[PDB]
């Protein structure tokens, strides 16, 4: 038995179209902008820049360790060892995917502190740009507004070159000095 | 277009470091009140040690636009809403020193100087520089410390095989 | 030695009024600087001029009720010159040698009570020597089963 979603659509006999997934912002049916949470409320897609993601997972495993000990009653290279220890505590251990993920995240995160990831998240989610771009803008370090618009091609006409270049400056300024 | 682009270029930069020193102090302040238990002498040094670090970056952030900001020197004009309730404006726009300025005098008078002027003063500067040069002597002695560097007996199964069959 | 250095690193004390008043000192004298770092958060509202400025502004509940973007400046790059070039500024750099001197005087004082603080630790060096002079059962108590209190020693029947 495998996992299901909040997307209920009834594909009766009519198999296909399964139209390709590209950054023409045409992601899956599953990674659509209009999502639905377990409380039925229509809620927007949640995309994470690897740092926003690093923090989320760390937070979740930290809180899990709490309940695991409760139910039992009756510097980056330094973060890697610290995280690899938390994984030994909460995770199934067979889950090697999370181990690599956490290592990659620790080594590639642009913003260390939660405070930092807070401003990143503000500055960006005010552009009206779709969660995918807003994440790739947070996770890909670009200098020219062309570097950005080339790598994130979906952006193309969505933002001024200057407006994007102004953002790229105040993004570089937020980067935690590793 | 009516009114003006006044100042505040690096003002955002001051605010950020102004906040982090506020944020680290505030949190220590909140705990400081649960004197019921002090957080672990590790914990307080983690918060009060990066809380002091926060003010180094906030200390320096002030000098970096340090030409720019004392030059900007803005005094407030606003909505007259600011004029009612008064003081808040006196308070919020005021620079001073506290009871602080006083141990600043205790310190200033603790030095060996005060009213003797320019020629004797320039000389003291050269002398303090000589003290810093005698401090280089630390470089020489550090070289001496000279500490820098870089970081079956057999087959179990077969034994048993023998015991059972005489296969050797 | 380590245990005793760890003891001094446990904040630990049994003081009445002595211990009491001291911690109240921390509360108020720390709180002051906490509160004055809040004037620092008020310079934040002082920006105004931008939406991200409003965000910083709401930092005061009184900013929540003092709507205006209020303040404005001009140019005295000349006054920056005066700050830097004044004979007063040369002199003020003397206030730098002066406070720094008294800081070095403090430093000297702290440093000396440190070697005498290591001297109470020589009482312990002696205790370890006493133990060196003169069962390796390893136990843990105060329950929990992990961490808590853990130590080792012998016993009799066998």
């Amino acid at each position: 038995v495998s996992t299901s979603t909040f997307q209920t659509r009834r594909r009766r006999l009519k198999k296909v179209e399964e139209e390709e997934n590209a950054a023409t912002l045409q992601l899956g049916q599953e990674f659509q902008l209009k999502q639905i949470n377990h409380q039925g409320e229509e809620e927007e897609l949640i995309a994470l820049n690897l740092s926003e993601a690093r923090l989320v997972i760390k937070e979740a495993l930290v809180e899990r360790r709490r309940a695991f000990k409760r139910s039992q009653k009756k510097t980056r290279e330094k973060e890697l060892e610290s995280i690899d220890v938390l994984l030994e505590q909460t995770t199934g251990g067979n889950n090697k995917d999370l181990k690599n993920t956490m290592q990659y995240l620790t080594n590639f995160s642009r913003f260390r502190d939660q405070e930092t990831v807070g401003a990143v998240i503000q500055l960006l989610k005010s552009t009206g740009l779709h969660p995918f771009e807003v994440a790739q803008l947070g996770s890909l370090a670009c200098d020219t507004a062309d570097e950005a618009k080339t790598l994130i091609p979906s952006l193309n006409n969505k933002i001024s070159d200057d407006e994007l270049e102004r953002i790229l400056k105040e993004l570089s300024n937020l980067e935690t000095l590793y | 277009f009516d009114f003006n682009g006044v100042p505040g270029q690096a003002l955002d930069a001051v605010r950020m470091r102004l906040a982090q020193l506020t944020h680290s102090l505030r949190r220590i302040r909140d705990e400081m009140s649960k004197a019921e238990l002090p957080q672990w002498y590790t914990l307080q040094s983690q918060l009060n040690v990066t809380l002091s670090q926060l003010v180094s970056v906030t200390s320096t952030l002030q000098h970096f636009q340090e030409t720019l900001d004392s030059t900007v020197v803005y005094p407030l004009p606003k909505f007259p809403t600011t004029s009612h309730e008064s003081l808040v404006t006196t308070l919020l726009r005021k620079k001073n020193i506290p009871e602080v300025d006083e141990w600043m005098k205790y310190v200033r008078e603790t030095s060996g100087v005060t009213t003797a002027l320019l020629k004797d003063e320039e000389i003291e500067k050269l002398l303090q520089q000589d003290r810093e040069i005698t401090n280089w002597a630390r470089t020489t002695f550090r070289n001496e410390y000279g500490k820098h560097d870089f970081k079956k007996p057999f087959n179990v199964d077969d034994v048993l095989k023998f015991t059972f069959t005489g296969e050797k | 030695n380590e245990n005793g250095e760890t003891d001094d690193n446990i904040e630990t004390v049994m003081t009445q009024e002595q211990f009491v008043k001291r911690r109240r000192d921390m509360l108020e004298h720390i709180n002051l600087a906490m509160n004055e770092s809040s004037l620092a958060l008020e310079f934040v509202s002082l920006l105004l001029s931008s939406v991200k400025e409003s965000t910083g502004m709401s930092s005061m509940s009184p900013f929540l009720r003092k709507v205006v973007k209020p303040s404005s400046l001009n140019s005295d790059k000349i006054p920056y010159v005066a700050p830097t070039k004044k004979e007063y500024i040369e002199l003020d750099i003397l206030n730098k040698g002066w406070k720094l001197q008294s800081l070095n005087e403090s430093k000297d004082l702290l440093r000396a009570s440190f070697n005498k603080l290591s001297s109470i630790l020589q009482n312990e060096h002696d205790y370890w020597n006493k133990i060196m002079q003169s069962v390796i059962f390893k136990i843990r108590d105060r329950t929990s089963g992990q961490k808590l209190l853990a130590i080792k020693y012998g016993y009799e029947d066998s």
Binding site: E115, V120 | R26, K94 | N35, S38, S61
Partner: peptide, 25 residues
């Protein structure tokens, strides 16, 4: 996103920042 909300404390009862000497005509 530094923390969440911004810590009030606003104060006019503090030590004092103003002096006084031009009161006389």
């Amino acid at each position: 996103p530094s923390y969440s909300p911004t810590s009030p404390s606003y104060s006019p009862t503090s030590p004092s920042y103003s002096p006084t000497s031009p009161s006389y005509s």
